[PDB]
Enzyme design. Sequence first.
Site, PDB file in Angstrom:
ATOM      1  N   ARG A 236       0.494  -1.087   0.041  1.00 31.62           N
ATOM      2  CA  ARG A 236       0.292   0.009  -0.265  1.00 31.62           C
ATOM      3  C   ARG A 236       0.810   1.133   0.101  1.00 31.62           C
ATOM      4  O   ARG A 236       2.429   1.053   0.174  1.00 31.62           O
ATOM      5  CB  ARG A 236      -0.985   0.121   1.091  1.00 31.62           C
ATOM      6  CG  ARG A 236      -0.494   0.460   2.812  1.00 31.62           C
ATOM      7  CD  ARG A 236      -1.138   0.221   4.051  1.00 31.62           C
ATOM      8  NE  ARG A 236      -0.988   1.389   4.760  1.00 31.62           N
ATOM      9  CZ  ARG A 236      -1.477   1.225   6.137  1.00 31.62           C
ATOM     10  NH1 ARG A 236      -1.967   0.759   6.432  1.00 31.62           N
ATOM     11  NH2 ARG A 236      -1.049   1.917   6.987  1.00 31.62           N
TER      12      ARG A 236
ATOM     13  N   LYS B 277       4.945  -7.534   5.070  1.00 29.67           N
ATOM     14  CA  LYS B 277       4.291  -8.140   6.100  1.00 29.67           C
ATOM     15  C   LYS B 277       2.784  -8.426   6.129  1.00 29.67           C
ATOM     16  O   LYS B 277       2.524  -8.967   7.355  1.00 29.67           O
ATOM     17  CB  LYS B 277       5.039  -7.541   7.787  1.00 29.67           C
ATOM     18  CG  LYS B 277       4.050  -6.215   8.042  1.00 29.67           C
ATOM     19  CD  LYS B 277       4.095  -5.796   9.060  1.00 29.67           C
ATOM     20  CE  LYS B 277       3.765  -4.621   9.972  1.00 29.67           C
TER      21      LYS B 277
ATOM     22  N   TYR C  52      11.284   8.653  15.261  1.00 36.69           N
ATOM     23  CA  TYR C  52      11.261   8.370  13.378  1.00 36.69           C
ATOM     24  C   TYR C  52      12.725   9.668  12.861  1.00 36.69           C
ATOM     25  O   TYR C  52      13.434   9.004  12.223  1.00 36.69           O
ATOM     26  CB  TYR C  52       9.829   8.686  13.528  1.00 36.69           C
ATOM     27  CG  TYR C  52       9.552   8.892  11.699  1.00 36.69           C
ATOM     28  CD1 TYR C  52       9.305   8.405  11.062  1.00 36.69           C
ATOM     29  CD2 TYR C  52       9.858  10.564  11.064  1.00 36.69           C
ATOM     30  CE1 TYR C  52       9.398   7.982  10.159  1.00 36.69           C
ATOM     31  CE2 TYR C  52       9.294  10.697   9.729  1.00 36.69           C
ATOM     32  CZ  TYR C  52       9.289   8.934   9.308  1.00 36.69           C
ATOM     33  OH  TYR C  52       9.007   9.862   7.710  1.00 36.69           O
TER      34      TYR C  52
ATOM     35  N   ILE D 206       3.386  12.855   2.273  1.00 36.49           N
ATOM     36  CA  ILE D 206       2.788  11.687   1.109  1.00 36.49           C
ATOM     37  C   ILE D 206       1.395  11.534   1.537  1.00 36.49           C
ATOM     38  O   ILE D 206       1.339  10.721   2.407  1.00 36.49           O
ATOM     39  CB  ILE D 206       3.175  11.026   0.283  1.00 36.49           C
ATOM     40  CG1 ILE D 206       4.685  11.594   0.031  1.00 36.49           C
ATOM     41  CG2 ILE D 206       2.650   9.904  -0.949  1.00 36.49           C
ATOM     42  CD1 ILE D 206       5.582  12.655  -1.478  1.00 36.49           C
TER      43      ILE D 206
ATOM     44  N   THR E  80      -0.803   9.013   2.159  1.00 35.74           N
ATOM     45  CA  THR E  80      -1.090   7.429   2.065  1.00 35.74           C
ATOM     46  C   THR E  80      -2.054   6.835   3.368  1.00 35.74           C
ATOM     47  O   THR E  80      -2.462   7.819   4.277  1.00 35.74           O
ATOM     48  CB  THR E  80       0.798   6.805   2.355  1.00 35.74           C
ATOM     49  OG1 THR E  80       0.480   7.295   3.960  1.00 35.74           O
ATOM     50  CG2 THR E  80       1.607   7.412   1.352  1.00 35.74           C
TER      51      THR E  80
HETATM   52  N1  LIG Z   1       3.326   9.141   3.771  1.00 34.97           N
HETATM   53  C1  LIG Z   1       4.462  10.366   3.931  1.00 34.97           C
HETATM   54  O1  LIG Z   1       4.011  11.744   4.000  1.00 34.97           O
HETATM   55  C2  LIG Z   1       5.854   9.696   4.023  1.00 34.97           C
HETATM   56  C3  LIG Z   1       6.740  11.192   4.010  1.00 34.97           C
HETATM   57  C4  LIG Z   1       8.214  10.795   4.239  1.00 34.97           C
HETATM   58  C5  LIG Z   1       9.088   9.345   4.128  1.00 34.97           C
HETATM   59  N2  LIG Z   1       7.990   8.529   4.235  1.00 34.97           N
HETATM   60  C6  LIG Z   1       8.710   6.920   4.474  1.00 34.97           C
HETATM   61  O2  LIG Z   1       7.535   6.223   3.085  1.00 34.97           O
HETATM   62  C7  LIG Z   1       8.027   5.072   3.512  1.00 34.97           C
HETATM   63  C8  LIG Z   1       6.520   4.500   3.466  1.00 34.97           C
HETATM   64  O3  LIG Z   1       5.485   5.138   3.951  1.00 34.97           O
HETATM   65  P1  LIG Z   1       3.834   5.098   3.806  1.00 34.97           P
HETATM   66  O4  LIG Z   1       3.042   6.445   4.430  1.00 34.97           O
HETATM   67  O5  LIG Z   1       3.732   4.517   2.248  1.00 34.97           O
HETATM   68  O6  LIG Z   1       3.165   4.311   4.785  1.00 34.97           O
HETATM   69  P2  LIG Z   1       2.405   3.058   4.988  1.00 34.97           P
HETATM   70  O7  LIG Z   1       2.129   2.671   6.712  1.00 34.97           O
HETATM   71  O8  LIG Z   1       1.035   3.679   4.486  1.00 34.97           O
HETATM   72  O9  LIG Z   1       2.587   1.819   4.110  1.00 34.97           O
HETATM   73  C9  LIG Z   1       3.966   0.868   4.505  1.00 34.97           C
HETATM   74  C10 LIG Z   1       3.724  -0.549   4.040  1.00 34.97           C
HETATM   75  O10 LIG Z   1       4.856  -0.913   4.661  1.00 34.97           O
HETATM   76  C11 LIG Z   1       4.883  -2.399   5.231  1.00 34.97           C
HETATM   77  N3  LIG Z   1       5.476  -2.762   6.280  1.00 34.97           N
HETATM   78  C12 LIG Z   1       5.858  -1.914   7.564  1.00 34.97           C
HETATM   79  N4  LIG Z   1       6.550  -2.578   8.604  1.00 34.97           N
HETATM   80  C13 LIG Z   1       7.229  -3.426   7.119  1.00 34.97           C
HETATM   81  C14 LIG Z   1       7.698  -5.138   8.296  1.00 34.97           C
HETATM   82  N5  LIG Z   1       8.344  -4.872   9.136  1.00 34.97           N
HETATM   83  N6  LIG Z   1       8.068  -5.212   6.830  1.00 34.97           N
HETATM   84  C15 LIG Z   1       7.782  -5.551   5.686  1.00 34.97           C
HETATM   85  N7  LIG Z   1       6.777  -4.461   5.363  1.00 34.97           N
HETATM   86  C16 LIG Z   1       6.588  -3.524   5.838  1.00 34.97           C
HETATM   87  C17 LIG Z   1       2.605  -2.466   5.887  1.00 34.97           C
HETATM   88  O11 LIG Z   1       3.116  -3.725   5.797  1.00 34.97           O
HETATM   89  C18 LIG Z   1       2.143  -0.949   4.934  1.00 34.97           C
HETATM   90  O12 LIG Z   1       2.342  -2.219   3.437  1.00 34.97           O
HETATM   91  C19 LIG Z   1       8.412   4.807   5.052  1.00 34.97           C
HETATM   92  O13 LIG Z   1       9.432   4.742   4.746  1.00 34.97           O
HETATM   93  C20 LIG Z   1       7.865   6.203   5.431  1.00 34.97           C
HETATM   94  O14 LIG Z   1       8.520   6.662   6.550  1.00 34.97           O
HETATM   95  C21 LIG Z   1       6.598   8.662   4.393  1.00 34.97           C
HETATM   96  O1  LIG Z   2       4.120   9.637   8.486  1.00 34.79           O
HETATM   97  C1  LIG Z   2       4.660  11.396   8.673  1.00 34.79           C
HETATM   98  C2  LIG Z   2       5.368  11.402   7.844  1.00 34.79           C
HETATM   99  C3  LIG Z   2       4.606  12.494   8.080  1.00 34.79           C
HETATM  100  C4  LIG Z   2       6.196  14.057   6.712  1.00 34.79           C
HETATM  101  C5  LIG Z   2       7.014  13.042   6.461  1.00 34.79           C
HETATM  102  F1  LIG Z   2       7.746  13.680   6.232  1.00 34.79           F
HETATM  103  C6  LIG Z   2       7.459  11.815   6.913  1.00 34.79           C
HETATM  104  O2  LIG Z   2       8.683  10.969   6.840  1.00 34.79           O
HETATM  105  C7  LIG Z   2       6.624  10.813   7.715  1.00 34.79           C
HETATM  106  C8  LIG Z   2       2.941  11.714   9.467  1.00 34.79           C
HETATM  107  C9  LIG Z   2       1.491  11.690   8.528  1.00 34.79           C
HETATM  108  C10 LIG Z   2       0.590  12.138   8.717  1.00 34.79           C
HETATM  109  C11 LIG Z   2       0.669  13.028  10.375  1.00 34.79           C
HETATM  110  C12 LIG Z   2       2.390  13.164  10.925  1.00 34.79           C
HETATM  111  C13 LIG Z   2       2.718  14.003  11.651  1.00 34.79           C
HETATM  112  C14 LIG Z   2       1.872  14.757  12.338  1.00 34.79           C
HETATM  113  C15 LIG Z   2       1.980  15.649  13.867  1.00 34.79           C
HETATM  114  C16 LIG Z   2       3.177  15.137  14.738  1.00 34.79           C
HETATM  115  O3  LIG Z   2       3.828  16.614  15.417  1.00 34.79           O
HETATM  116  C17 LIG Z   2       4.337  14.450  13.897  1.00 34.79           C
HETATM  117  O4  LIG Z   2       5.090  14.282  14.757  1.00 34.79           O
HETATM  118  C18 LIG Z   2       3.929  13.738  12.803  1.00 34.79           C
HETATM  119  N1  LIG Z   2       3.328  12.096  10.418  1.00 34.79           N
HETATM  120  O1  LIG Z   3      -5.524   6.857   1.891  1.00 32.67           O
HETATM  121  C1  LIG Z   3      -4.654   7.498   1.362  1.00 32.67           C
HETATM  122  C2  LIG Z   3      -4.621   7.458  -0.513  1.00 32.67           C
HETATM  123  O2  LIG Z   3      -3.597   6.535   0.191  1.00 32.67           O
HETATM  124  C3  LIG Z   3      -3.231   6.099  -1.143  1.00 32.67           C
HETATM  125  O3  LIG Z   3      -1.750   5.336  -1.142  1.00 32.67           O
HETATM  126  C4  LIG Z   3      -4.129   5.770  -2.029  1.00 32.67           C
HETATM  127  O4  LIG Z   3      -3.552   5.927  -3.391  1.00 32.67           O
HETATM  128  C5  LIG Z   3      -5.364   6.561  -2.500  1.00 32.67           C
HETATM  129  O5  LIG Z   3      -5.593   6.248  -2.846  1.00 32.67           O
HETATM  130  C6  LIG Z   3      -5.376   6.564  -0.973  1.00 32.67           C
HETATM  131  O6  LIG Z   3      -6.958   8.127  -1.082  1.00 32.67           O
END
Ligand SMILES: NC(=O)c1ccc[n+]([C@@H]2O[C@H](COP(=O)([O-])OP(=O)(O)OC[C@H]3O[C@@H](n4cnc5c(N)ncnc54)[C@H](O)[C@@H]3O)[C@@H](O)[C@H]2O)c1
Ligand SMILES: O=C(c1ccc(F)c(O)c1)c1cccc(-c2ccc(O)c(O)c2)n1
Ligand SMILES: OC[C@H]1O[C@@H](O)[C@H](O)[C@@H](O)[C@@H]1O
Lengths: 253, 253, 253, 253
Positions: C15, C37, C150, C183, C185
């Site tokens: 996802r 996982k 984090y 992003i 997600t």
């Molecule tokens: N969403 C953001 O804004 C954001 C911003 C910057 C960086 N990131 C990084 O991007 C990556 C993905 O984030 P996301 O928002 O898509 O998260 P998410 O939680 O939506 O998806 C993460 C996926 O990784 C899997 N996962 C978690 N632990 C695992 C493990 N031990 N082994 C295998 N799979 C595992 C989960 O089951 C899930 O399908 C992460 O490294 C996160 O730190 C996210």
């Molecule tokens: O997973 C998140 C995230 C957000 C931005 C990032 F750059 C990143 O690597 C991860 C996320 C998603 C939703 C809320 C928050 C968040 C909100 C308030 C906070 O004080 C915080 O530390 C994180 N972080």
């Molecule tokens: O749940 C937040 C978003 O996650 C993304 O990974 C999916 O592509 C979107 O359909 C969904 O709106």
Amino acid sequence: TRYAGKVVVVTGGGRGIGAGIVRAFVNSGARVVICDKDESGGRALEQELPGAVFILCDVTQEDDVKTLVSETIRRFGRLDCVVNNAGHHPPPQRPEETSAQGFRQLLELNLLGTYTLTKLALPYLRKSQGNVINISSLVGAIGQAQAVPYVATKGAVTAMTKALALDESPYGVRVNCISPGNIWTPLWEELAALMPDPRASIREGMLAQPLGRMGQPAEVGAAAVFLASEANFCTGIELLVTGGAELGAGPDI
Amino acid sequence: TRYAGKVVVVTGGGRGIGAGIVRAFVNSGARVVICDKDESGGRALEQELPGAVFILCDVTQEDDVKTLVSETIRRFGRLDCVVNNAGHHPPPQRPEETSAQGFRQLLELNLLGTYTLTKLALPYLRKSQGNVINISSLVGAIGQAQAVPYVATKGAVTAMTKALALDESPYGVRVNCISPGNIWTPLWEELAALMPDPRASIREGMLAQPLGRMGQPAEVGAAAVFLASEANFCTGIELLVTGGAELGAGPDI
Amino acid sequence: TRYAGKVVVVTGGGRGIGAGIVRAFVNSGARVVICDKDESGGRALEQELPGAVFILCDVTQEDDVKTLVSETIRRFGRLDCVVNNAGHHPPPQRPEETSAQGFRQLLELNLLGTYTLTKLALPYLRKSQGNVINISSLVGAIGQAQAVPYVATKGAVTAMTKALALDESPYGVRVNCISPGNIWTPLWEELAALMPDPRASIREGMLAQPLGRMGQPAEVGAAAVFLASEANFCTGIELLVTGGAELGAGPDI
Amino acid sequence: TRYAGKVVVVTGGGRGIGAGIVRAFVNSGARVVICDKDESGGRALEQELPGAVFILCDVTQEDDVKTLVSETIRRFGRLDCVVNNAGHHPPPQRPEETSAQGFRQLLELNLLGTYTLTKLALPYLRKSQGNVINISSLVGAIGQAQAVPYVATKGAVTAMTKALALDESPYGVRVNCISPGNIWTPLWEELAALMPDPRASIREGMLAQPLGRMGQPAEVGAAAVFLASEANFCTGIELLVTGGAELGAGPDI
Ligand SMILES: NC(=O)c1ccc[n+]([C@@H]2O[C@H](COP(=O)([O-])OP(=O)(O)OC[C@H]3O[C@@H](n4cnc5c(N)ncnc54)[C@H](O)[C@@H]3O)[C@@H](O)[C@H]2O)c1
Ligand SMILES: O=C(c1ccc(F)c(O)c1)c1cccc(-c2ccc(O)c(O)c2)n1
Ligand SMILES: OC[C@H]1O[C@@H](O)[C@H](O)[C@@H](O)[C@@H]1O
Ligand SMILES: NC(=O)c1ccc[n+]([C@@H]2O[C@H](COP(=O)([O-])OP(=O)(O)OC[C@H]3O[C@@H](n4cnc5c(N)ncnc54)[C@H](O)[C@@H]3O)[C@@H](O)[C@H]2O)c1
Ligand SMILES: NC(=O)c1ccc[n+]([C@@H]2O[C@H](COP(=O)([O-])OP(=O)(O)OC[C@H]3O[C@@H](n4cnc5c(N)ncnc54)[C@H](O)[C@@H]3O)[C@@H](O)[C@H]2O)c1
Ligand SMILES: NC(=O)c1ccc[n+]([C@@H]2O[C@H](COP(=O)([O-])OP(=O)(O)OC[C@H]3O[C@@H](n4cnc5c(N)ncnc54)[C@H](O)[C@@H]3O)[C@@H](O)[C@H]2O)c1
Ligand SMILES: O=C(c1ccc(F)c(O)c1)c1cccc(-c2ccc(O)c(O)c2)n1
Ligand SMILES: O=C(c1ccc(F)c(O)c1)c1cccc(-c2ccc(O)c(O)c2)n1
Ligand SMILES: O=C(c1ccc(F)c(O)c1)c1cccc(-c2ccc(O)c(O)c2)n1
Ligand SMILES: OC[C@H]1O[C@@H](O)[C@H](O)[C@@H](O)[C@@H]1O
Ligand SMILES: OC[C@H]1O[C@@H](O)[C@H](O)[C@@H](O)[C@@H]1O
Ligand SMILES: OC[C@H]1O[C@@H](O)[C@H](O)[C@@H](O)[C@@H]1O
Ligand code: NA
Ligand code: NA
Ligand code: NA
Ligand code: NA
């Protein structure tokens, strides 16, 4: 007198950069608690310097650190600055020669020891509007060869410094780091002695800086005293003490 | 006494950050030459501070700068540090409201004035193993809204600092910069007064820093004295004095 | 056809960003192994996409990862790119609310899981002159509030990327990272739902970017395909996919 | 077809990096206007490439640039991307060998030419939700020896990129830069030929990168096409195409 009446804890203060930091703070008028896991250097430094005392403490042992803080408060009645200097650089290691367990152990020292003392000290630093100084490394920013675990730990320390600076800003506690480059310390000497050509490895270390020499512990110490005593609008900075190593440079297929 | 016996030139030293730098160096034991294009602030500062004198000099006029250097040497017999602080921030301007000629003029002050004094001072700085401190800005690194020309000039100053640090390292002359964030100065006050809501623009300026206030000239001054007097292994660094503004943060279509 | 004939492993591909990366690589002509996982998302994605298959694998379990690599080679005969995307952001936590053991556990996932797969994959990447893409975060570079563990893990990943890039450069294997900002997600949605005002936390997340929206998984995916397929002179870079969040800004006592 | 139906202007497109960028955009399906002050390379490229045409234009002459934009619109009916690649590196020069007037002239080309085309193009880029790509340099970030003016100009371009990204974000126009390291171009060949030992200067240039070679124009071109066509959440970034030169390293008195 720049830091007169203040109380400072320096981890790994028994030799090297840490001892230079201890000396700089004593010269600024502060009382200093030297923390080290080894007795030899720190005990001698306590005898040498009025204003410095030695407490045996391994920063990877939470109960040692709890006692470090409680003894500092018991003996001196306040805490103004923690300098998280304890750390280690393993010998050069190819990535395939590293292990997850070795990486965990280096994280325990270089990252979690800093985390633990900072956490235990923060309630007292809030009371004194004190500050945290972490000793990171230039190589966290630019990388280093044959040092994947070490580089990762220092990237973590620099980033953690910025996160905690944000969190503690409303409480008036500044959190900064110093990223040294090559500083001539007993660790540098020890690692060079393992090399096939020690003198050549040292000369190469000197020439990696535009300034043509390695740095001194006293120079890191001066940067620490500045951060503690005069940098009141600096938080979350990475202060480079590197001699210029990050600068400059040193058919298409 | 940290910089006793030394001679420092501060450009734009008549008010604001420059005056704070002048004061910090006088308090460190140095003799200071205040350069400014306007007489009012600098002449009063010369009367106020034993150890500081005022020389009228517009850093965009090469002959003014030649005379600044030759008079410094004639009167004090050495030159140890130049602080290139003179500069200006125009009012906020949309990119389409800027002009090439306005951009050239801002480059003349913020970039080429720094270049010219440094060039003329370097022969004397080599004799004294002195150092250069340029006052750049955080916004050179992170950008700023409605300020394309200003931001470009400060990106240039920071980069030039690193290039010259490389070139002058073999001659023992360090070259560093300070990148302030929001510092409360007469320029800040003047620009705020032009805004439709001055008090709201000032409050917003204060809150752009995790520390919740703007910086002071004295805090930039302390950073400058550190760079000149105690940062002997630092060259080509950008020392951030910003209150943390670069840190942190402040549906997908 | 930009990455036709190539084999890619994406961790946490079931996802979110990982699934976007999977899709981008399939659209480029590659065969993709989805590691996760959890079964739910990844198994559906395997049915949806010709060219993608799902392997259950927890990146914190070394034997799961050993099997991930050996099954990839057994089924597809080569390995060209590993994308280390699996990771987690805990709910916002004040520093004093964190624990060393929670910090260790987050390091296990966000840092050591990346380390372990990369190590096990590198012998095959050397044979194919393949490449490593780590998914770090902007907040490793600039900090984030209420996220000390984090932020530290992502500072470590970015730094490790640079160290390994140096070590693997003689063997022709590039090592890069992508630092996303906000992003949209399922993790973002989940964390927002815990907030007292979810809609306000989401709007605030959107407005933290000059572009005024959050990013999409597909946009991270496009950056990954670029790094794998067309960035042949890039190694040790941190590619920002943040909407400009690091830019700009958002009485002296 | 990644950039089909789009119209791109590349300055200095007649040879070197610019020609590589022209080729990459034509291969992506775009129509390209090659701008250059010299006829030789660009006219041949127009004959070689269906989809590319040549317009003689010196970016330091505002009326040339006004005509470049108006002719692009007259002939192709839209403008989607400007690539500001025209620039020059003078021979190595010691700081004391530079002049203010030479520095001004280099600023005119490397900085103000980029500024002028961007300004004149922005109204059309807003209509098309287009984007700006500036070709800066790694040395703006890390410095370079014997190149004070050049380094300053590139620090300015990188910073200007970030400022304009902020200003144009509300209008949907992204503004990014590419910072190449050593790329093998006719300029590189020309400067090497002036050195006392040309072959040794070239070998040293190759070895300044962990990857052990210089980059190619095509590799900068691929980065430009990515920024234009697929980096929709990237604005104000500095995309490094350097082979790792900024990484790594290459008694205390
Ligand atoms: N969403 C953001 O804004 C954001 C911003 C910057 C960086 N990131 C990084 O991007 C990556 C993905 O984030 P996301 O928002 O898509 O998260 P998410 O939680 O939506 O998806 C993460 C996926 O990784 C899997 N996962 C978690 N632990 C695992 C493990 N031990 N082994 C295998 N799979 C595992 C989960 O089951 C899930 O399908 C992460 O490294 C996160 O730190 C996210
Ligand atoms: O997973 C998140 C995230 C957000 C931005 C990032 F750059 C990143 O690597 C991860 C996320 C998603 C939703 C809320 C928050 C968040 C909100 C308030 C906070 O004080 C915080 O530390 C994180 N972080
Ligand atoms: O749940 C937040 C978003 O996650 C993304 O990974 C999916 O592509 C979107 O359909 C969904 O709106
Ligand atoms: N020397 C350099 O070139 C250099 C460069 C950049 C960063 N650093 C950092 O500076 C710091 C000091 O390095 P150094 O060269 O002075 O090293 P050093 O080995 O000479 O001194 C380190 C000191 O820390 C102590 N120490 C180690 N583990 C400890 C523990 N668990 N608890 C308490 N004390 C402990 C040691 O006993 C020793 O007295 C380290 O964090 C290192 O990563 C050093
Ligand atoms: N105030 C801030 O928030 C801030 C932030 C970052 C950087 N800076 C930089 O700090 C420096 C000082 O800014 P400030 O806020 O103190 O400004 P200010 O306008 O209050 O003071 C500037 C001083 O420089 C003098 N000066 C201007 N042009 C000159 C010239 N041609 N020759 C000689 N002197 C000249 C002025 O007369 C004045 O005394 C500038 O370089 C500015 O770009 C300021
Ligand atoms: N080659 C490298 O290693 C390198 C590295 C980093 C950055 N850069 C940058 O990349 C760009 C291209 O460099 P290159 O090595 O391809 O150079 P080059 O000299 O081989 O090609 C530059 C082209 O720009 C044209 N040009 C020069 N002045 C012009 C003007 N006033 N108006 C219009 N066209 C003009 C030239 O005629 C030529 O065709 C420059 O901005 C340079 O600073 C180059
Ligand atoms: O502890 C050292 C060190 C050196 C530089 C640093 F910035 C740092 O944080 C630590 C050190 C001392 C002596 C040799 C080495 C060294 C030499 C070759 C290497 O491949 C390596 O990874 C490290 N490091
Ligand atoms: O001089 C100023 C300044 C502010 C911050 C800086 F880092 C800097 O180098 C200079 C200043 C003072 C008061 C207001 C402003 C300002 C306000 C809104 C703007 O859009 C802008 O570009 C600048 N700048
Ligand atoms: O144009 C050159 C260049 C080289 C690297 C760059 F990043 C860049 O932006 C431009 C180039 C080409 C050949 C030699 C040199 C060079 C060699 C020695 C020098 O001292 C120097 O300043 C430049 N520069
Ligand atoms: O062993 C290397 C160096 O270590 C430093 O910490 C000491 O101050 C020096 O006396 C010694 O030369
Ligand atoms: O005008 C704003 C501020 O400028 C500073 O340079 C002065 O030191 C302050 O007294 C004044 O409040
Ligand atoms: O002259 C150096 C190089 O310049 C590049 O722009 C050309 O594509 C190459 O054919 C040439 O070898
Ligand atoms: Na004592
Ligand atoms: Na006086
Ligand atoms: Na499938
Ligand atoms: Na054609």
